Amino acid sequence: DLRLHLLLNTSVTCNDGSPAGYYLKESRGSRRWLLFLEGGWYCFNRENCDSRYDTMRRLMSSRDWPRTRTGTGILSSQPEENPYWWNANMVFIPYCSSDVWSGASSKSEKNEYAFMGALIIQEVVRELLGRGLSGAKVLLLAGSSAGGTGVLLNVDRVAEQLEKLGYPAIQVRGLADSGWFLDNKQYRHTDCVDTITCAPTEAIRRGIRYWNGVVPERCRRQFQEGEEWNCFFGYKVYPTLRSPVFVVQWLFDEAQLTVDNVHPVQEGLRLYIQNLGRELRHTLKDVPASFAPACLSHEIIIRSHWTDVQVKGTSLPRALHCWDRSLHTPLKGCPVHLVDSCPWPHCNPSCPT
Ligand SMILES: Cc1ccccc1OCC(=O)Nc1cccnc1
Ligand SMILES: *[C@@H]1O[C@H](CO)[C@@H](O)[C@H](O)[C@H]1NC(C)=O
């Protein structure tokens, strides 16, 4: 199991001011480190954050966290469950900031909640250097759903932090799972007046101001003041990134469909769904490290059965291993770019049931 450590710097906090933290299982023979960001939506104003505190409190506070957690999927230490990185040092960072890992604002006389996601990642990295990370050769920052978007927003900052601290030999890389969203037209639509009616772009623009949210520097410089919300969308931020990033994305992601107001399918909805798959596939055509099956699902990398899905005969653990080999051009029988071309959910027989 992975063991809980609360941060020694207790000024870096979850939403309610309790200390943030991480779960760790060391592997002393290994110089590989996997730091995984949890997901779980977000909140963007006082009223909706208050509701989240009543019934989603573990995503806002460490008060009730358990002392241990079992590693699953890519966080498993058994080769049977994790063919890719079973011998690595494993870290699970709980999401308790409700800010897509972007925030840098403390609780104060002016702020009911703290939004410190960007500062939590930096503080975890700092405290791990004293526990073995100083001797690493590869640090893979991974994450699912809001945590996948968090990888995109934070991977280059982790790289800059380690360089400035004097560790230029640690190779920082990202693995973004189910965090690559489209700011597309919705299937049915409403003007932004509450949580359920506010479209992704309008909700993120309000959140960024509420959280004091920060985005990667090169993307910020392209879009400029007031337009930083654009950098939460993978196809817009990815081209600006310098660290290698592997992108895992279902073509018909369930969270994407929910934000699009989609739930015996007639012509209009058939065309909408087929167009969404085509648009997603278009955005990945120049992403050389990617895995994108034609399934209706959400998240995969910490699921126990993540080994089952294949694209063109290649599983996800195999694709990631091929990525590792490519970063030692293309490799015989060891592909890294795997995107389905069939146009309807479950046209791939390996999709999750
Ligand atoms: C849509 C989006 C774009 C960029 C960055 C983050 C985003 O949203 C993450 C998320 O988790 N959304 C969600 C909405 C309702 C129910 N579940 C999930
Ligand atoms: C605690 O965290 C803040 C914010 O990341 C940092 O600037 C500060 O120096 C830390 N405190 C100590 C004693 O390192």
Query: What DSSP state is assigned to residue 186?
Result: P
* Residues that are catalytic: 145, 253, 298
CB 234 within 8 A of CB 179: yes
What is d(CA 257, CA 261) in angstroms, rounded to the nearest whole number? 6
What are 340's two structure tokens? 């389905």
Q: Which candidate, 234, 267, 270, places its Cα nearest to that of 344?
A: 270
Alpha helices in 61-142 (DSSP H): 117-129
Tokens found for residue 25: 């299982």
Distance (Å, rounded) from C-alpha 165 to C-alpha 172?
A: 14
User: 334: which 2 tokens?
Assistant: 């060891």
Is residue 157 within 8 Å of residue 210, measured between CB atoms? no
110/131 Cα distance (integer angstroms): 36
- Across the chain, the runs of DSSP E, i.e. the strands, are 2-6, 21-25, 32-37, 68-69, 89-93, 138-144, 171-177, 245-248, 252-253, 290-292, 296-297, 310-311, 314-315, 337-339
CA distance 57 to 64: 9
Residue 112 has φ and ψ, to the nearest 5°, of -65, -35
**Strand pairing report for 314-315 and 310-311:** antiparallel
Question: Which residue in the block uniquely carries the two structure tokens 């337009």?
Answer: 227
Report residue 22: phi and psi, to 5°. -155, 155
Query: Taking a C-beta distance cutoff of 8 angstroms, is the pair 338, 289 a contact?
Result: no
Burial class (CB in 10 A: 0-12, 13-18, 19+), 108: exposed
* Contact criterion met (CB below 8 Å) for 141 and 35: yes
Q: Is 263 exposed, middle or buried (0-12, 13-18, 19+ CB in 10 A)?
A: exposed
Q: What's the CA gap between 305 and 258, in Å, rounded? A: 24
Nearest Cα to Cα of residue 289 among 249, 346, 342? 249
First to last CA, the chain: 28
The whole-angstrom separation of Cα 318 and Cα 314 is 6
| Alpha helix positions (H), the chain | 46-55, 117-129, 146-164, 200-211, 217-223, 234-237, 254-259, 267-283, 316-326
Our mutation pick for probing the ligand 2 site, out of 8, 9, 157, counting the most ligand atoms within 8 A of Cβ, is: 9
Contact between 331 and 325 under an 8 Å Cβ cutoff? The reply is: yes
Report CA(9)–ligand 2 centroid distance (Å): 6
Nominal resolution in Å? 1.5
State the virtual CA torsion across 224, 209, 157, 119 in degrees, nearest 10: 160
Method: X-ray
Q: Which of 6, 7, 10, 11 to mutate to test the pocket of ligand 2 (most atoms within 8 A of CB)?
A: 11
Tell me the residue type at 201.
T
Describe the crossing of helices 117-129 and 146-164 by its angle, rounded to 10 degrees: 50
Please count the residues of the chain: 353
Q: Is 25 helix (H, G, I), strand (E, B) or coil?
A: strand
As given in the structure block, the two tokens for residue 34 are: 């996997």
Nearest CA to ligand 1 atom 5: 232
CA dihedral 79, 82, 85, 90 (to 10 degrees): -100
